[PDB]
Ligand SMILES: NC(=O)c1ccc[n+]([C@@H]2O[C@H](COP(=O)([O-])OP(=O)(O)OC[C@H]3O[C@@H](n4cnc5c(N)ncnc54)[C@H](OP(=O)(O)O)[C@@H]3O)[C@@H](O)[C@H]2O)c1
């Protein structure tokens with residue numbers, strides 16, 4: 394199903410994650426995006442950064458051309474990268490993403506992160522970046538606009554901007570049973586802003602920014618117990634948890650069997666006791682943890 398966003402558009406509650414590290418051929422994105430749409434995914438998450446918008450857009454166009462879906466059936470997200478925060482760079486970055494994907498509009502365009510980089514850190518008033526995003530919604534380049542990796546103070550900055558025209562529809566953030574963001578989630582619900590969870594299955598544990606000593610979420614013994622109780626899988630428990638707390642959840646997989654498994658999240662539900670057990674795993678663990686950004690002036694986990 395879908396959640397109604399605060400601008401009246403609708404976002405499917407399960408999303409497909411398209412990021413894969415540079416060792417995976419670019420052409421894999423094309424193949425797995427078509428498999429995702431075949432399995433039932435209708436929300437597809439990409440970004441300028443992922444260097445795959447050509448392949449992702451071609452997958453969506455291929456599934457439109459063969460009659461599987463209409464354009465208005467797909468919710469496609471792209472993201473403005475942090476070297477493009479200066480307001481004059483926002484609409485060109487979005488137009489470039491549209492040309493790569495060969496689409497007329499995105500369903501969602503996000504500020505990918507608040508940590509501005511030189512167009513080496515940069516200092517940019519993100520209120521002015523937001524005004525440029527608003528202009529892209531008014532032009533019809535993006536049906537909806539949102540933010541990603543913002544903390545509550547950063548979100549309030551936008552919500553409190555003089556002459557704000559559109560609130561963010563969402564804040565896409567790292568969110569899973571080790572780092573469940575309840576307080577931020579509550580703040581988002583109080584403003585009718587959707588929290589969208591990434592690394593909901595514990596991240597890809599990329600060696601460039603994730604500590605290999607960190608616990609592997611899908612080997613968690615409480616998730617394994619719940620998967621055995623429901624005869625499902627640790628991944629499906631982790632996804633289902635987000636749906637039941639009102640969080641829209643992404644899931645990346647480049648494996649045909651796991652892509653088809655992940656749509657089963659709609660097939661079962663967890664009890665209040667199961668959900669309390671998963672809530673008991675919260676331990677302030679974000680898998681992103683690198684000197685590369687941890688001392689950025691707008692690092693969101695500084696709090
Ligand atoms: N806004 C941002 O800054 C940001 C940051 C990070 C991620 N994201 C978005 O969120 C998406 C997902 O987050 P993520 O990349 O961190 O990965 P994720 O969804 O947490 O997935 C982690 C690993 O789970 C595996 N997996 C998937 N389904 C499974 C299943 N049913 N059973 C066992 N393992 C399974 C996948 O491996 P296999 O491929 O081998 O199946 C994947 O590499 C990204 O692709 C991107 O679209 C956004």
Ligand SMILES: Cc1cc(CC(=O)O)n(C)c1C(=O)c1ccc(Cl)cc1
Pocket residue numbers: 412440442506542681686692693694
């Ligand atoms: C973690 C991560 C994973 C990816 C790839 C993706 O979007 O799939 N991105 C771009 C990041 C960030 O830039 C990021 C850096 C620091 C912080 Cl605090 C939050 C996000």
